[PDB]
Amino acid sequence: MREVISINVGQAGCQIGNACWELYSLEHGIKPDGHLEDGLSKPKGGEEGFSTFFHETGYGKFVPRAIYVDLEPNVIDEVRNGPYKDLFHPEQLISGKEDAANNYARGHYTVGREILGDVLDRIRKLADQCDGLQGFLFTHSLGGGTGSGLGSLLLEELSAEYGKKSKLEFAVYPAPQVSTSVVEPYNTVLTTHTTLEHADCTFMVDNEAIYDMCKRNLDIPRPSFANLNNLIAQVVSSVTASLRFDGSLNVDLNEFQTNLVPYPRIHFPLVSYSPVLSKSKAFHESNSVSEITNACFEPGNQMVKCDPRDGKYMATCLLYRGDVVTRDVQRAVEQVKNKKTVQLVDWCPTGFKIGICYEPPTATPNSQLATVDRAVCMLSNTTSIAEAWKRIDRKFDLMYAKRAFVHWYVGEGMEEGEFTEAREDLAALERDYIEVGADS
Amino acid sequence: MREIIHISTGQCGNQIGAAFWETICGEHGLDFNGTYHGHDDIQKERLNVYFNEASSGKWVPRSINVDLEPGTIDAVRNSAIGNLFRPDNYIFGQSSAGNVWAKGHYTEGAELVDSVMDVIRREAEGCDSLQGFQITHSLGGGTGSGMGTLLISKIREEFPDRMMATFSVLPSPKTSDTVVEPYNATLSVHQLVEHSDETFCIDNEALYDICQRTLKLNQPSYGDLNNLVSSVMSGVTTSLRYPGQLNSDLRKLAVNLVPFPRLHFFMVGYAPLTAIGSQSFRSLTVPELTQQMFDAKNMMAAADPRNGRYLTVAAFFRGKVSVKEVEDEMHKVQSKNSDYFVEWIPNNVQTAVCSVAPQGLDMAATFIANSTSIQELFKRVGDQFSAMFKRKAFLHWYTSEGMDELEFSEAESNMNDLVSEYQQYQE
Amino acid sequence: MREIIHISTGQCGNQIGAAFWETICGEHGLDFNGTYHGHDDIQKERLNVYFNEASSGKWVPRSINVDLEPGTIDAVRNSAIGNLFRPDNYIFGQSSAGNVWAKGHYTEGAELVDSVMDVIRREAEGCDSLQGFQITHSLGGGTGSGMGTLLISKIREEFPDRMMATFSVLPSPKTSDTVVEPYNATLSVHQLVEHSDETFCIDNEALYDICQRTLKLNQPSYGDLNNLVSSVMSGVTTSLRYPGQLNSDLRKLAVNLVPFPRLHFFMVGYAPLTAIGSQSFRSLTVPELTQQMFDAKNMMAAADPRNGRYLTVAAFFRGKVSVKEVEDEMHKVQSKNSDYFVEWIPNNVQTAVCSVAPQGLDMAATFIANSTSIQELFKRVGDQFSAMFKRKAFLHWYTSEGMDELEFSEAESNMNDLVSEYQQYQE
């Protein structure tokens, strides 16, 4: 339970993985060469971390255990040009000459299943090299159907392979307003059922919310995909803060599994991070921890295009960085309960988990961040997720009415039966989620 | 499948391919002899894509020029830029097509088809990463309207897996050197609508209008129009030429630009339409480029999008632009033009931005639209069809050629199928 | 057994041997006056193989030149390489055979065969490591096709164990000036099948076609054709002489290149074949040579792969080549040419590599095949014989010679039997 395997699938997934590895290097002060980087600490690695993501070698050079898979050679060449490839092993990465399809047709097809055995034996060899395992981390965008199908195939193969560690999947969601890809809703809906069958826990993040945040909080005129990558890297690092750096209240992955799954089928947590702001305003403004807890409930920090007030509260967790006073956060959570911002349920209500980590948050130079000694990462289970599901499903059905494209999918690897089945599965999931949220 | 071959045919399409190669070597940087001068490695990969690395660091373009009158290909071979051309690239015969659909392929093409298929097979053997063909020809030109349709049918029958892409220029309906030109155009499109997966509409009259407005020249120069269409082709292929935030394949563009196997016709538009001296008057901003892409006459297809109906639109940009800014602009123009834009998609937009910018332009844009008004651009020609051989003038020529009324009625029925699809899908 | 003897006779085979020695002295680099210029050790060994260590370090190539006209030896003496020769190395008689095989090997051949056999016995006594006997003569001319046939018969009677490399030139069917040419050719081969064990099909018309398609020469000249055949003949012997990854010997081919001893004919092919002036565009690769070898246009036999079924094939290479590349090419050509490749082998391949780079080239390759198209030439020459001696015109000459028509029918029936052997093995 000391190692976590991270997988980078698709173009956006590979970029996010690159950003997370760069941020992990920056937190521990790791340079492209390293050898640890360098050997003086304790707790920059060793000891753990790095012992959860970076593989320890006989020479001491920490190899970040990452598997970059994509059938687009340009992205693979790009990620090979950087020093990250030197950090990784040349055999860990997988290359493809011709992209699967646009986008989910071949990504889930048997052509995408041909490399399944290759990557499976790669993962088996990597596990044989290391010692112990806590879970499987996944990084693929639900917008990219290629990455979606490939990640679902890997998740199914890992569930059929080990089934002993919690399968984590970080999914990127497109903007509900505009969609550049016309089959993007089809790919996402078809992938939802696969992730329901395979994933033990999910992560839903919206690009449009990230862009609104960086335009508003960081006060930037021009958003960039690199800024989104940096923000998601900060998020992912905030998730595994206790596993990398020791804190006053070290939290476990199994604790996340217990808190986020209080029912037979509840594995959809929403992410919120605060305080996030421009570094200049961070130098100008100094808020309290209660203000940060309140901003955690704002619609912007939730990284979703849904209002959290209509959502119904469920079991949530809050990770804290740097120095954090227990009595202060107790007072803050009591004040929050007194506010009754999000409507509470009858099962969970006393469901605010608190975890503290000594590692203070780090601000990347590319993307601004509120420079503060203590950060707050809230993983909630509000019922706005059902709202996003219905929002995308309405457009999915409006399309599938005429669907304008079904010939390609039914000829390549699919059929209208599979589309109808995925639609019914999404509808049943929405109905069950609304039911479990409304019975309180 | 990253490599592409630029096919060339037609008495005018050869100049188009020449200007395309010239713009390529001027944009990425290359010597006329073939010595590599681009920077640094992605341009070398694109040289691998479009050229063959010859001995001594030399490059040779992967183009197939097949026409008649070898004097023209010899003269353009004497050009300075055309010094790196391989003798196997151009396969020319004698002597002239006579500007008739029969002699172009039915009489002369039957003997050169074996040689050109041998050449294309040797090319496919030389490079296996081939994914599609880029064909520039004249739909009204005799050599073009004759040989292009036959070679396209041959490629469709032999290489169905490989993609298709053509840049045929449409004959002007108002002015014509002869009445047989649109007739051959119709007899060619009769099969082009079947054996082609992608085509671009180009009208010489629209080119004359845009050079009278922007270039502001009384007598239009065909070389400048070649330069414009070559810049358009370069901005189209920049998705693979230069890595950007999102690079797409021609198959990915096609599956999103057409819902059905039909709709191969596409309306073209380029920006910025820089007029001489207007470089200081105006500054490069994305709303101006959007307005230019919205202008009916700025299109070179050319059709009126207001009279028609937006079926599928896609504007691919180059340079330094913001994703949120262009998304806001596209949402604004879809909301304000909701009557033009079809609404059951509801978002018929497909934008792909290129990282680098073209030389001399801080930002550029290539817009490809699909409107229902294009049926008119067909109808007139079809009308001209029923207006030209209803008098049965020079019909003895075609009877001696061996053509029958069955294929003419078949071309008319193909136009009828096209307009019915334009009204299925009512405008 | 590295030493190999060369014999030159006939009106054109004399020039063929002259060009062969030109290429020999050009490969390693040698003066035409017997002055050693190679470096360092191997060249002396190839001298001992072909030349003789005369006085003062001199070197004279071991060649037997014989013809009915002393003008031929005068002309080859006029050349630089081959001007000097020991008078015993060449004996020439008078005057002509009248383009008759029977008269040629009866009267013109018998009076000098004694002297030339004594001479060749002397040189065989001098050359201890003799293995093979290259032969350069013309099958078309009755003089050559008779004299060389008689000499090969006498050598087979004298040296049954030594190899016999026959590079004779088959007649061209277009030439109809003398109808006795194919008749003399078939009468000569009817005996050479038993007199010689290694023969190579060479058509004059094939040489004309290849020099008009690659060299693009206006009028056929024997000089360039002789240069090409000399290069081909020197490649197959340098494969063993010059060090390589795998050398090939005449016994190796006699045991591998032919399944049954009744077959002695070997098709020919050379690469690279680059057009004049296009050498800058050409880049020496394995796939281009592989494609060249399996094309009838590049062969000089010249047999058609599409027409005749392949019994066996062999491709020898020079310069730096990788075993993996040639193995992949052979697998691909076996997968695609499985129709011609016969099933009872089932995989026919014979490879040889020479490490050193060819003279003036980075890599050069030769090709040999045993296809069912040679029986077509046999049928053609038999039909020629029958249709010519059905008229009974000029047959009075051969009645005066004393030959019988029963022998002619026996020869034609044996040729038909060889065709049937090539039909067993059906086409």
Curated annotation (Swiss-Prot), chain A:
Cofactor field: Mg(2+)
Which sites bind Mg(2+)? E72
Q: What is the effect of changing D252A?
A: Poisonous alpha-tubulins that cause lethality. Microtubules do not depolymerize
Q: Which InterPro entries match?
A: Alpha_tubulin, Tub_FtsZ_C, Tubulin, Tubulin/FtsZ-like_C, Tubulin/FtsZ_2-layer-sand-dom, Tubulin/FtsZ_GTPase_sf, Tubulin_C, Tubulin_CS
Q: Which GO terms describe its biological process?
A: homologous chromosome segregation; microtubule cytoskeleton organization; mitotic cell cycle; mitotic sister chromatid segregation; nuclear division; nuclear migration along microtubule; nuclear migration by microtubule mediated pushing forces
* GO CC terms, sorted: cytoplasm; microtubule; nuclear periphery; nucleus; spindle; tubulin complex
What effect on the protein does mutating E255A have, as reported in its record?
Poisonous alpha-tubulins that cause lethality. Microtubules do not depolymerize
What domain of life is recorded for the organism? Eukaryota
What does the UniProt keyword field contain?
A: Cytoplasm, Cytoskeleton, GTP-binding, Hydrolase, Magnesium, Metal-binding, Microtubule, Nucleotide-binding
User: What GO annotations for molecular function exist for this entry?
Assistant: GTP binding; hydrolase activity; metal ion binding; structural constituent of cytoskeleton
- Catalytic residues (positions): E255
Q: In the Enzyme Commission scheme, what number(s) does this protein have?
A: 3.6.5.-
UniProt main location, coarse? cytoplasm
According to its UniProt record, this protein's enzyme class is hydrolase
The region annotated as signal peptide is none
- PANTHER family associated with the record: TUBULIN
Miscellaneous field? Present with 5590 molecules/cell in log phase SD medium.
Its biological purpose:
Tubulin is the major constituent of microtubules, a cylinder consisting of laterally associated linear protofilaments composed of alpha- and beta-tubulin heterodimers. Microtubules grow by the addition of GTP-tubulin dimers to the microtubule end, where a stabilizing cap forms. Below the cap, tubulin dimers are in GDP-bound state, owing to GTPase activity of alpha-tubulin.
Subunit relationships:
Dimer of alpha and beta chains. A typical microtubule is a hollow water-filled tube with an outer diameter of 25 nm and an inner diameter of 15 nM. Alpha-beta heterodimers associate head-to-tail to form protofilaments running lengthwise along the microtubule wall with the beta-tubulin subunit facing the microtubule plus end conferring a structural polarity. Microtubules usually have 13 protofilaments but different protofilament numbers can be found in some organisms and specialized cells.
The name on file for this protein is Tubulin alpha-1 chain
